[PDB]
Amino acid sequence: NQFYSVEVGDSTFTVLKRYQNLKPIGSGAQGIVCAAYDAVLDRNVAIKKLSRPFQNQTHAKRAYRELVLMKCVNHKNIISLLNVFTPQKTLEEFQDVYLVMELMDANLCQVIQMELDHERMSYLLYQMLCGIKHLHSAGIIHRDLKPSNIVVKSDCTLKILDFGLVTRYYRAPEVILGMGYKENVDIWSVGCIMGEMVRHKILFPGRDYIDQWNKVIEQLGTPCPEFMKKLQPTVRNYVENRPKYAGLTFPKLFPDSLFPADSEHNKLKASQARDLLSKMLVIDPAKRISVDDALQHPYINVWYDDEREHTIEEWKELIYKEVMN
Numbered sequence: 001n002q003f004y005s006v007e008v009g010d011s012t013f014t015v016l017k018r019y020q021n022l023k024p025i026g027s028g029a030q031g032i033v034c035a036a037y038d039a040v041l042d043r044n045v046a047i048k049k050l051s052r053p054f055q056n057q058t059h060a061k062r063a064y065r066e067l068v069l070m071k072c073v074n075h076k077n078i079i080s081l082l083n084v085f086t087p088q089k090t091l092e093e094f095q096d097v098y099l100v101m102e103l104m105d106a107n108l109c110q111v112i113q114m115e116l117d118h119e120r121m122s123y124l125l126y127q128m129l130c131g132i133k134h135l136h137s138a139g140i141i142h143r144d145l146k147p148s149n150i151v152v153k154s155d156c157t158l159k160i161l162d163f164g165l166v167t168r169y170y171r172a173p174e175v176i177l178g179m180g181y182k183e184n185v186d187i188w189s190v191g192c193i194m195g196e197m198v199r200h201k202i203l204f205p206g207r208d209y210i211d212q213w214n215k216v217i218e219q220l221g222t223p224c225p226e227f228m229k230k231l232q233p234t235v236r237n238y239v240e241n242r243p244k245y246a247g248l249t250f251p252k253l254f255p256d257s258l259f260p261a262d263s264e265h266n267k268l269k270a271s272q273a274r275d276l277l278s279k280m281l282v283i284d285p286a287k288r289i290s291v292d293d294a295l296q297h298p299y300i301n302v303w304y305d306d307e308r309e310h311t312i313e314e315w316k317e318l319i320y321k322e323v324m325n
């Protein structure tokens with residue numbers, strides 16, 4: 001037989017025999033991930049199992065989305081699919097999907113923990129922005145970018161793992177407050193990651209939505225009252241009739257002591273970094289920098305040179321065909 005089974009975490013991966021020595025390298029909600037040796041191609045791969053894609057609408061829609069976009073999207077800063085398979089032989093038996101992609105060497109959480117280096121941070125942020133730009137050009141606004149869905153090779157090449165849409169640490173104010181969004185929603189998430197590379201602390205932790213919002217305004221200040229008028233009626237009473245917070249300036253939010261010091265080079269880079277932070281970490285999306293302007297920012301520019309609803313049966317059929325195709 002062409003398949004074999006191996007126990008992975010709490011579950012069972014059933015894979016083609018080309019894929020050998022499966023070891024877990026991570027998990028997300030969407031499914032669990034193994035490194036493996038692909039003996040046919042003679043290289044290492046990452047293998048993700050989708051168990052309950054067609055269990056319910058939510059799971060099926062996202063599985064179908066992930067599968068179709070991973071096949072249709074080709075960009076250096078988006079993870080590439082190498083193979084797709086199911087061990088089941090017919091539609092009736094069909095249960096699981098396995099996605100095989102290129103293996104990276106670390107998550108962004110690990111790189112965030114390393115000492116601050118301008119050329120690395122600049123490069124990582126350029127690549128993230130390149131990836132985001134390309135998704136937006138294809139009509140995909142991510143809305144869920146976070147360190148745990150970004151991976152990197154040891155040479156600092158960066159790859160976004162997924163196409164997006166609790167712990168809402170990286171989500172933009174407009175999304176948390178449910179107030180409609182545009183492309184620059186993803187810029188907030190980049191700003192949260194950039195600040196975290198500098199501070200080595202999650203910028204905006206929170207027990208829940210309320211405290212999450214509190215922590216943003218604590219730091220950035222309560223926004224201009226024009227912003228609140230766009231809030232659904234009760235969200236608005238909360239925000240509007242809370243206490244006015246004067247936040248902190250960007251030099252106070254990210255002091256000189258966090259950055260390389262005592263050369264003009266490092267002095268320039270520190271203020272470019274803080275300048276970029278101050279344009280991304282902006283509560284009101286109408287004042288937040290765009291993807292294109294961020295690519296042109298002097299800290300970054302050194303690197304230039306459907307939704308329709310289905311039944312369960314139908315989602316299963318659509319997914320199956322996408323796999324078999």
Ligand SMILES: CSc1nc(C)c(-c2ccnc(Nc3ccc(N4CCOCC4)cc3)c2)[nH]1
Pocket residue numbers: 025026027028029033035046048079101102103104105106107148149151161
């Ligand atoms: C939701 S998490 C996730 N999903 C996928 C599809 C991946 C993925 C995709 C491609 N490559 C990797 N390479 C990779 C990432 C990290 C590590 N580390 C090894 C030590 O322990 C901490 C992580 C090892 C290898 C991971 N990650």
